[PDB]
Amino acid sequence: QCEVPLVRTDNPKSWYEDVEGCGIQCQNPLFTEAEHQDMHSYIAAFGAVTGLCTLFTLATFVADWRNSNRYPAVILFYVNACFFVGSIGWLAQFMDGARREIVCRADGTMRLGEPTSNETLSCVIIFVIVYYALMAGVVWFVVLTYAWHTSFKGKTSYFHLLTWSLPFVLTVAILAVAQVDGDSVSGICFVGYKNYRYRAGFVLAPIGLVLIVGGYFLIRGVMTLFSIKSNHADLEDNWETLNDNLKVIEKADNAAQVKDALTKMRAAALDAQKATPPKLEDKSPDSPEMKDFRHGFDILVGQIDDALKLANEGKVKEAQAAAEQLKTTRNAYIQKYLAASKINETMLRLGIFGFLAFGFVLITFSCHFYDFFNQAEWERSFRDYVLCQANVTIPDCEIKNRPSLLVEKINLFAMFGTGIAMSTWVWTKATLLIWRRTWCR
Ligand X SMILES: CC1=C2C[C@H]3[C@@H](CC=C4C[C@@H](O)CC[C@@]43C)[C@@H]2CC[C@]12O[C@@H]1C[C@H](C)CN[C@H]1[C@H]2C
Work out whether 185 is an interface residue with ligand X (CB under 6 A). yes
Contact between 109 and 13 under an 8 Å Cβ cutoff? The reply is no
Closest residue to ligand X, judged by C-beta, is 183
CA 14 to chain centre: 41
In whole angstroms, the minimum distance from the beta carbon of 24 to ligand X comes to 5
Q: Tell me which residue of 67, 213, 141, 162 sits closest to 419, measured CA to CA.
A: 141
Q: Does 186 bind ligand X (CB under 6 A)?
A: yes
Kindly state the smallest distance separating residue 2's Cβ from ligand X, in Å.
14
53 CB burial (10 A radius; 0-12, 13-18, 19+): buried
Q: Within 93-152, which residues bind ligand X (CB under 6 A)?
A: 112
The reply on whether position 237 binds ligand X by CB under 6 A is no
Stretch that binds ligand X, among 90-98, 157-165, 185-193, 214-222 (CB under 6 A): 185-193
| Site membership for ligand X, residue 24 (CB under 6 A) | yes
Longest pairwise C-alpha distance within the chain: 113
Which of residues 105, 144, 149, 183 is near ligand X by CB under 6 A? 183
Among 375, 422, 425, 426, binds ligand X (CB under 6 A): 375
Q: Which of 193, 198, 416, 425 binds ligand X (CB under 6 A)?
A: 193
Shortest distance in whole angstroms from residue 183 CB to ligand X:
3
Nearer to ligand X, 79 or 112 (CB): 112
Give Cβ neighbours of residue 58 (< 8 Å, ≥ 6 apart): 77, 80, 81, 84
CB nearer to ligand X: pick between 7 and 350: 7
Based on CB atoms, which residue is closest to ligand X, 112 or 275?
112
| 13, 100, 194, 264: residue in contact with ligand X (rule CB under 6 A) | 194
Contact flag: residue 403 with ligand X (CB under 6 A): yes
| Nearer of residues 312 and 401 to ligand X, judged by Cβ | 401
- What does the binding site for ligand X look like in residue numbers (CB under 6 A)? 24, 28, 30, 112, 183, 185-186, 193-194, 371, 375, 378-379, 382, 403, 408
